[PDB]
Amino acid sequence: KVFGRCELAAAMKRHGLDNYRGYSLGNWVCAAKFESNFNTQATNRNTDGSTDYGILQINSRWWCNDGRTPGSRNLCNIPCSALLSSDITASVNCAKKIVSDGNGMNAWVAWRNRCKGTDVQAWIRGCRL
Numbered sequence: 143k144v145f146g147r148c149e150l151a152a153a154m155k156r157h158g159l160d161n162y163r164g165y166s167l168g169n170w171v172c173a174a175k176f177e178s179n180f181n182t183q184a185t186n187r188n189t190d191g192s193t194d195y196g197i198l199q200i201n202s203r204w205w206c207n208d209g210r211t212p213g214s215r216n217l218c219n220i221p222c223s224a225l226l227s228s229d230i231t232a233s234v235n236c237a238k239k240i241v242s243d244g245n246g247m248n249a250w251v252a253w254r255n256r257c258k259g260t261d262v263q264a265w266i267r268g269c270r271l
């Protein structure tokens with residue numbers, strides 16, 4: 143599924159991401175835009191052989207199992223394919239674990255380079271929430 147901007151904002155809000163660990167809704171929408179272009183089916187492979195999955199591009203090296211990343215962990219205890227569903231529940235619940243692990247949203251490279259320190263409120267402007 144390819145979400146619309148306001149559609150994804152409303153979905154994320156319903157799943158408890160607004161101000162989660164102090165990060166306003168606009169931060170999450172901005173990260174999803176630049177990680178996956180709002181596409182739940184996005185995949186990208188990394189140099190070390192791990193793969194990133196879904197709307198928030200969660201990495202198989204640490205967070206999910208894809209059966210082909212040797213010596214990796216599975217800290218969200220899910221198959222990586224569950225992160226590609228049109229229902230974003232699994233992606234959101236895993237993201238909550240990631241953002242709580244001490245490094246906040248700096249875990250997402252696109253957020254650090256393209257969202258951090260910008261006016262992220264603009265990403266939810268005009269949406270009915």
Ligand SMILES: [Cl-]
Pocket residue numbers: 163164245246247
């Ligand atoms: Cl933080």
Ligand code: NA
Pocket residue numbers: 202203204205206207208211214215216
């Ligand atoms: Na893994």
